Amino acid sequence: EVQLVESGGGLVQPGGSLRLSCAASGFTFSSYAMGWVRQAPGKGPEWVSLISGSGGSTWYDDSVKGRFTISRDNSKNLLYLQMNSLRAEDTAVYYCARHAPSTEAPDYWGQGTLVTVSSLE
Numbered sequence: 001e002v003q004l005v006e007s008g009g010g011l012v013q014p015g016g017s018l019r020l021s022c023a024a025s026g027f028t029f030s031s032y033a034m035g036w037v038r039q040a041p042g043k044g045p046e047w048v049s050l051i052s053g054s055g056g057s058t059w060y061d062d063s064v065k066g067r068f069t070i071s072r073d074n075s076k077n078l079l080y081l082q083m084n085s086l087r088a089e090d091t092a093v094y095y096c097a098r099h100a101p102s103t104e105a106p107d108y109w110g111q112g113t114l115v116t117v118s119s120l121e
Contacts, residue, residue, distance in 0.1 A: 002026035002108045006096040009113025016086050016117070022079040022096030022110055029077045030054060033099040036070065036081050037109065038092040049081060050099065063089070086117045 006022045020036070035050035049070040050059040058070050069082040079096060096110035 002098070004096045004098065004108055004110035006094070006110040006113050009094060009115045011116045011118065012086050013119045014087060014117055017082070017084045018086060018115060019083065020081040020094060020096070020113060020115075024077045024079070024096075024098070027098070029072075030074045033101075034072060034079045035059075035097050035099055036079075037095040037097050038090075039095070039112075040092045045095070047097075048094070051079070083115070086115075088117045091115060091117045 003025045004022055006020055008018060008020045010018060012018055030053045033050055033052055036048045037045045038048045039045040046061065048061045048064055049068055051057070051070045051072055055072045055074065060068060060070070067083065067085045071080045071082075072078065081094070083090065093112040093114055095112050098108045100107055
């Protein structure tokens with residue numbers, strides 16, 4: 001019933017920019033903190049950014065402060081991540097995620113979108 005579908009990932013050269021979107025349904029959107037998880041291929045997942053239910057408060061991992069901007073549109077149930085000045089290190093699968101602190105089951109994630117920062121030179 002809970003659905004998370006992300007869009008907008010892909011290939012970009014270094015210094016480029018990308019915008020991820022995430023559409024939700026199956027729950028009351030604004031009653032959950034939402035965020036973005038990243039997973040590099042040989043590594044565990046980490047939270048890259050988090051936004052409060054209302055969107056009044058945000059958090060960013062130190063490695064992305066200033067470059068990435070998280071936002072949400074509670075009237076259309078959408079979560080965004082504007083990713084600027086992309087660096088090779090930003091390469092990973094990014095997951096849209098619904099943070100449920102009260103739920104014991106793991107958080108719901110979207111299917112994941114690959115983000116590759118690469119110049120073939």
